[PDB]
Amino acid sequence: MKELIYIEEPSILFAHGQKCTDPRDGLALFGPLNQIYGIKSGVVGTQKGLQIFKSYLDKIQKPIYNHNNITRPMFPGFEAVFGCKWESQNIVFKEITDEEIRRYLFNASTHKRTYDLVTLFNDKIITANKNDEERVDVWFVIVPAQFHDQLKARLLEHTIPTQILRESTLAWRDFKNTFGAPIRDFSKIEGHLAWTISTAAYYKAGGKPWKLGDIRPGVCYLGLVYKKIEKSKNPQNACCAAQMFLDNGDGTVFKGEVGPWYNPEKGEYHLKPKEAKALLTQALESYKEQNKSYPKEVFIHARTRFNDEEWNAFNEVTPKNTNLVGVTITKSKPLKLYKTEGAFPIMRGNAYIVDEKKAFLWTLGFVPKLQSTLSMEVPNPIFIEINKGEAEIQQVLKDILALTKLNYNACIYADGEPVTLRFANKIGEILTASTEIKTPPLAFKYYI
């Protein structure tokens, strides 16, 4: 008997002052914001992966089709969408000298193997970026317990972007299973697979494809979400990571003070008030540094509810003009709103509000510009609530819908949850891999 609400899809901004909702469609027509003419993206990997990479590069120039080419549009070619040259010759294409195949003796330690392989790639990148003079922008790694986080963790301290690919994804067509089937069948998503790789590798090569262009000045969509470390000796010890996000998407990241913020009995996550003031002030001072004016609002996002004493650790470091509200974001709570008739679920952008604080938002569904739903079955929404502070629920709903579209690791139409959450999720795990380094750098390239 009640009534729903819909939010118009925020329009991102591309080069030449042109705004198109679809990141893939607008990019092809117009091009990225910053035209990095020199894309000298280096490659570091084994020879088989290198020629797999080399074969893939010329494939990037050629158009790559999706057998269903309305939901996952064309990928005409890197020089067409971006207007920046990229080939298999300008690369430095240094080779990982891993052809040694010999075993004097093994050991019953997978972590030692995991540490060995991760270490064997870090030094090779290090020995290259210092010796050379030409501007290598990426160091794609080829791979024939966890590897990616620590490989990025050690590389984090050296301030040099890196991407890891090609377990089976780059050459899936030939890299079939053991029974004559594609172990990762990309025949349906061949055109889309090259889309994300081209967009992501461009961004971490000094790029910045698109940024939002319908914002009100003076805002700051900081993202603060707790993480967990399973290797900490203290049972309650877990990492907290902040995340600065402006309209452009090129914010700053500060490692929060790790400490025992886990409560086994209460099942909640909160920090001491003293360091809460520093984390907000450090982030607040950084935004003032990059904008010269203090923000009129701080929509700090979170995924866990917070107490009041922590809130009182924010109301005093915030100037009188500034206002700050901490919105919690959850998705475990389900509300599947099946359509009355037809097999097509509700489009993304619809939202359910229950009060001035709690609300449901559907960021998934059949897109009215895609004729397809980004979810396998009927998609559940995200439960977002204004935990503390007073704000407008419609504004945060519209902004959180906008912030979901600004994802650069992937060129999908719109992420299900804000990048302030997912990007924080991976960087926290990277931090837990190597907590030694105090790494404050503005760039997200050494992270994503």
């Binding site: 050629k62 070619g77 067409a80 599947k336 709103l337 099946y338 359509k339 097999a343 489009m347 009927v378």
Partner: protein, 450 residues
């Protein structure tokens, strides 16, 4: 007024670069005409030949990729283009925008290799500016560059094709409202009427034990069977709380606030579900953190209930619809169920390994969508219902909760495009004896293939 560029391509066939090339061409400044770029009355007709190929064209572009030598559309316009070039007595009019690399040198249209061909097979980076430089050296007219029109015209092509439409319609929720509740809640405790060693989860009626404060919903004389010395007491000394006010939050005392009571009702409203699953004749599954309940094999009319196939066979395995319940009462006192699909080889014994259960679960729900899922959820609720209007969940000897079967209705504003038949795929109906008759052959063969 001769400041236009003509594009010829196989509109229905696999020629889709004409869209992006035209947008860039109009983006760069050239006034480009294509089949798709003019979509308001048909697609292609004699009107293209009538005016623009004669009086309003400067270049003619052919997408000779796969069937340029064969398709009538490319050939019939090329015949017009060839003779209209002779009328102008020009030199460079038609351009062979070869696309497909597989088009061999010995397999090419005779009527196109008359003029030199720009190359697009290996990469566009050679071909994109090749049109540009050729236009400049041939003094092709150029409006000043502007990408505003490219964005504007891009929207118009795919505006009526697809966008959000403000037409009101309703949605069927996953939430089942509760409208009838017992008028009072009673807590029984003497610290000696029951011990703190026996299990309360196995009690005949919904009740659990806390460290110091006991909870239940029945009288003091309904728990003799589990352990004696309970019926002798009177109900006047029990702790009675009005249920109508225990949820609104108006009640609040020293022992528990209103919020502790909300968590207690949730525990009672959920633990009581398992007893109703011994009344409707369904099997129980030891699901993680919850319990999934599904109907047995062929219990209803040939594995289906109310013309809904709640039970079916996936090739070798048997799949059955099932749900797990959860009671939340924050926005309103409602019941929530999580849809589930449970597999069994035959029904006598379920599959021991959970990994195969989930992997098989993933494939089965892959070809499922909104209505195919919604109608199969409401079906498992109506059958579970003890009455047409609502279900009867027993919590007390003389008082039982009443949960409606029809979920709450939400109505929106934006649904989908005005024209119907969004996806015209697999709509015909043929005389078949079994569901997925020809479909299983397609699915099984593809698994063998890949």
């Amino acid at each position: 007024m001769r400041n236009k560029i003509f594009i010829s391509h196989a509109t229905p066939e696999d020629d889709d670069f004409t869209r992006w090339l035209s947008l860039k061409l109009i983006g760069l400044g050239y006034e480009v005409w294509c089949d798709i770029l003019f979509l308001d009355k048909g697609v292609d007709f004699w009107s293209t030949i009538e005016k623009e190929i004669r009086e309003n064209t400067c270049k003619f572009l052919i997408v000779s990729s796969t069937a340029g030598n064969k398709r009538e559309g490319v050939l019939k316009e090329l015949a017009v283009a060839t003779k209209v070039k002779k009328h102008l007595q020009d030199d460079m009019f038609i351009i062979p925008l070869a696309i497909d690399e597989n088009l061999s040198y010995d397999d090419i249209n005779i009527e196109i290799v008359r003029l030199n061909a720009i190359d697009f097979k290996k990469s566009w980076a050679k071909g994109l500016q090749d049109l540009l430089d050729a236009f400049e050296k041939q003094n092709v007219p150029k409006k000043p560059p502007d990408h505003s029109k490219s964005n504007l015209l891009y929207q118009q092509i795919f505006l009526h094709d697809k966008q959000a439409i403000e037409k009101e319609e309703t949605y069927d929720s996953n939430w089942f409202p509760i409208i009838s509740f017992p008028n009072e809640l009673r807590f029984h405790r003497y610290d000696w009427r029951l011990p703190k060693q026996f299990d309360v989860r196995t009690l005949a009626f919904p009740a659990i034990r806390y460290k110091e404060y006991l909870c239940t919903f029945a009288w003091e004389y309904d728990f003799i069977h589990q352990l004696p010395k309970t019926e002798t007491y009177n109900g006047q000394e029990s702790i009675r709380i009005s249920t109508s006010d225990i949820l609104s939050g108006r009640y609040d005392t020293d022992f528990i606030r209103n919020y502790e009571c909300q968590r207690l009702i949730v525990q009672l409203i959920n633990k009581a579900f398992e007893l109703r699953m011994k009344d409707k004749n369904v099997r129980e599954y030891q699901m993680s953190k919850t319990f999934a309940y599904w109907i047995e094999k062929g219990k209803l009319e040939k594995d289906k209930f109310e013309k809904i196939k709640l039970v079916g066979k996936q090739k070798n395995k048997y799949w059955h619809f099932g749900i797990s319940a959860a009671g939340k009462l924050y926005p309103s006192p409602v019941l929530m169920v999580s849809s589930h699909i449970i597999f069994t080889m035959d029904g006598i014994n379920l599959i021991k390994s959970k990994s195969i259960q989930h992997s098989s679960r993933r494939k089965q729900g892959k070809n499922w969508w909104n209505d195919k899922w919604r109608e199969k959820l409401l079906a498992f609720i109506r059958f579970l219902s003890d009455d047409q209007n609502a279900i009867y969940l027993n919590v007390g000897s003389e008082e039982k909760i009443l949960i409606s079967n029809k979920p709450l209705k939400f109505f929106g504003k934006m649904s989908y495009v005005t024209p119907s038949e969004v996806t015209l795929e697999e709509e015909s109906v043929l005389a078949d004896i079994n569901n997925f008759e020809e479909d299983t052959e397609d699915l099984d063969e593809l698994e063998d293939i890949e």
